[PDB]
Amino acid sequence: SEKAGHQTSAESWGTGRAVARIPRVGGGGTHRSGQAAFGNMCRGGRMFAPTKTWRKWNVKVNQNEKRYATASAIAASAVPSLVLARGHRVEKVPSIPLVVSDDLQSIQKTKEAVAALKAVGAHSDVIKVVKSKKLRAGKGKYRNRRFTQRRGPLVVYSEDNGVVKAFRNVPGVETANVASLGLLQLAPGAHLGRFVIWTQSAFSKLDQIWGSETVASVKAGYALPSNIISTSDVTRIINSTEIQSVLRAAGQATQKRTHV
């Protein structure tokens, strides 16, 4: 607000009269005249360090740093270890990097869309987003945040022929275009690996958006980031052949107790 605590006019009695000092209300004839004001400890007083509008809300981020994180999130869509660890019932599904035909792009109604998720390898993931639905613990109950529920699968596409309208009313399913595609949908709650459902035209477009060795990029002055190490498997390198053949033998891991 402002002008909250300042509305009353009050100054301290001071020394002589045995009380504290600290501003008291003027002498009328009520059950209030004599009481304190202004100070942060007082009833109906001022808030200490009152909140203001011009505090920093939004945060600027580098353009290359977003595209680094967004690219790594699309790598997390594949690899089955990160998907199962981050929820998702993906036991049935034959392999991952899951691609679907372009007949999906021309779906009209929900009745068609629900039957598609059963045949592909889902619906158990959508049934999860249904038993889930429960109340909040805090005060979102009376601030238009009355229910929680968990996230479902994502449906990526290139062209629109009524795909968004069909999957809108399905409990857990979200949709997104390939051209856009941000960090929020891919890695919500700062955890990698969401269960993505790609289409054929969407999956084929990824070389034209990001790039490869011979293929360019399209984004203005962008190439994909290279890693420090080539292959993540270090245990293969340490054993291998060339490194281990050089050096002296081990000392039996754990030693004896001496000078007991």
Partner 1 sequence: KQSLDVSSDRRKARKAYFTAPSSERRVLLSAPLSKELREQYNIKALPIRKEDEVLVVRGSKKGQEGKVSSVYRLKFAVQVDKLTKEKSNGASVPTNIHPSKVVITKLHLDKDRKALIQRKGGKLE
Q: Which stretch binds RNA (CB under 7 A): 81-89, 169-177, 194-202, 237-245?
A: 169-177
Cβ nearer to partner 1, comparing 62 with 144: 144
Separation of alpha carbons 40 and 60, rounded Å: 35
89 binds RNA (CB under 7 A): no
**Of these partners, partner 1, RNA, none, which one is at the site of residue 159 (CB under 5 to 8 Å by kind)?**
none
E-strand ranges in the chain read 10-11, 24-25, 99-100, 154-157, 174-177, 196-199
64 binds RNA (CB under 7 A): yes
2 is written with which tokens? 């402002």
55 binds RNA (CB under 7 A): yes
118 binds RNA (CB under 7 A): no
Query: In the complex, what is the shortest distance from the CB of residue 146 to partner 1, in angstroms, rounded to a whole number?
Result: 7
246 binds RNA (CB under 7 A): no
Burial of 201 per CB tally in 10 Å (0-12, 13-18, 19+): middle
Query: In the complex, what is the shortest distance from the CB of residue 202 to RNA, in angstroms, rounded to a whole number?
Result: 11
For the CA atoms of 6, 11, 15, 17, the dihedral, rounded to the nearest 10 degrees, stands at -100
Cβ nearer to RNA, comparing 16 with 94: 16
183 is written with which tokens? 């960090």
**Cα maximum dimension of the chain:** 99
Name the site residues for partner 1 (rule: CB under 8 A).
142, 144, 146
94 binds RNA (CB under 7 A): no
238 binds RNA (CB under 7 A): no
